[PDB]
Amino acid sequence: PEMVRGQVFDVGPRYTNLSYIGEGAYGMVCSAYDNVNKVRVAIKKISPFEHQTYCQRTLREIKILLRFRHENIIGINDIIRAPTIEQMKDVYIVQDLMETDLYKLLKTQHLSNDHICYFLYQILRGLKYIHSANVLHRDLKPSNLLLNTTCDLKICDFGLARVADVATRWYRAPEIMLNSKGYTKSIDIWSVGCILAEMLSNRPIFPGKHYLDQLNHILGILGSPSQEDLNCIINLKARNYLLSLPHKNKVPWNRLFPNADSKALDLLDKMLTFNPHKRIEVEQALAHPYLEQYYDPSDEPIAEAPFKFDMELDDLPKEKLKELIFEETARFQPG
Numbered sequence: 001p002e003m004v005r006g007q008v009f010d011v012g013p014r015y016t017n018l019s020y021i022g023e024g025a026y027g028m029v030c031s032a033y034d035n036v037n038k039v040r041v042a043i044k045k046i047s048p049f050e051h052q053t054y055c056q057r058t059l060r061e062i063k064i065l066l067r068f069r070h071e072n073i074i075g076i077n078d079i080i081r082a083p084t085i086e087q088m089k090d091v092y093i094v095q096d097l098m099e100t101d102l103y104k105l106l107k108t109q110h111l112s113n114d115h116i117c118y119f120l121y122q123i124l125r126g127l128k129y130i131h132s133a134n135v136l137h138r139d140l141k142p143s144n145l146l147l148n149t150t151c152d153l154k155i156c157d158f159g160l161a162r163v164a165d166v167a168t169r170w171y172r173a174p175e176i177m178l179n180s181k182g183y184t185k186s187i188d189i190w191s192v193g194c195i196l197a198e199m200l201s202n203r204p205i206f207p208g209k210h211y212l213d214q215l216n217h218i219l220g221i222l223g224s225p226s227q228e229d230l231n232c233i234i235n236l237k238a239r240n241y242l243l244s245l246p247h248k249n250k251v252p253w254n255r256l257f258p259n260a261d262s263k264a265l266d267l268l269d270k271m272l273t274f275n276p277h278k279r280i281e282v283e284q285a286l287a288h289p290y291l292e293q294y295y296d297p298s299d300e301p302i303a304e305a306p307f308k309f310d311m312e313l314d315d316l317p318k319e320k321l322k323e324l325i326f327e328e329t330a331r332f333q334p335g
């Protein structure tokens with residue numbers, strides 16, 4: 001029983017020597033030496049069960065990750081749990097041990113004009129898969145962007161995944177907190193775009209303290225939304241809500257990211273489009289001139305086959321979910 005700061009971590013004897021590398025109200029992330037593979041690793045503990053949405057995602061990121069396989073996605077190496085359901089009050093997913101994440105790097109480092117480019121390639125490259133897979137990450141953000149020794153990048157966390165058809169804050173598309181309930185591929189582009197700007201400026205472009213403040217920060221640069229040839233962004237109480245909202249001029253991109261690559265900005269523009277319906281797609285984004293020396297179609301794998309299981313949103317009550325999580329996490333259970 002190795003207790004790291006907070007609480008316990010029943011992972012040994014395969015995973016001993018613990019430390020700590022990341023926080024989070026839903027689970028503590030520790031690094032630990034694995035006596036079987038002879039290399040340290042990342043062990044994420046999760047204590048869901050109290051509530052459902054929680055166990056709903058717990059057994060969903062598992063489903064995703066266990067069935068995915070991309071170099072720009074950090075997979076599940078193995079899972080540790082108790083031997084009896086009635087005794088299972090926490091799951092530990094073992095993952096690779098990355099060097100650092102994109103939120104920390106920008107917190108100090110100054111990505112070169114190329115480094116920015118290479119990272120952004122990798123991101124979209126992994127994105128051009130979770131999508132081929134027809135799955136929305138919904139929560140892209142620096143923190144969920146792992147990095148290791150040889151500058152490898154990995155997208156982390158898939159609890160909000162959920163097929164195409166509480167959280168981050170600054171990289172959520174406008175409509176998420178506005179129009180149709182997210183659910184759509186463009187939600188991620190917007191997020192990947194928001195990360196792009198931060199690598200250019202090492203500071204979040206739309207750091208609005210709260211929804212409202214958020215929308216303002218945004219309108220701050222894109223200036224008042226259009227009311228010409230609209231479609232799924234119109235609105236009623238909102239539009240007039242703008243009747244209280246003066247009009248703001250779009251701030252060209254040169255005036256924010258002045259010393260930024262002419263193309264890096266063009267791409268940042270196709271991504272930060274208010275209307276999701278006129279927001280550049282993932283494949284068309286890699287294509288884009290900026291991401292040139294990297295765009296390699298015969299080296300950018302796409303999901304094996306789409307999803308659409310049976311558990312979705314609502315329905316299955318914890319008890320029912322717990323068993324599944326349990327039986328699902330059985331093949332990893334020794335013996």
Ligand SMILES: COc1cc(O)c2c(c1)/C=C/C[C@H](O)[C@H](O)C(=O)/C=C\C[C@H](C)OC2=O
Binds near residue numbers: 022096100101157
């Ligand atoms: C040394 O610094 C680190 C090296 C790593 O390899 C990880 C982390 C930190 C942890 C960061 C926590 C997250 O950013 C956030 O909660 C998340 O992304 C969820 C999955 C996290 C996964 C277990 O994390 C790592 O492997």
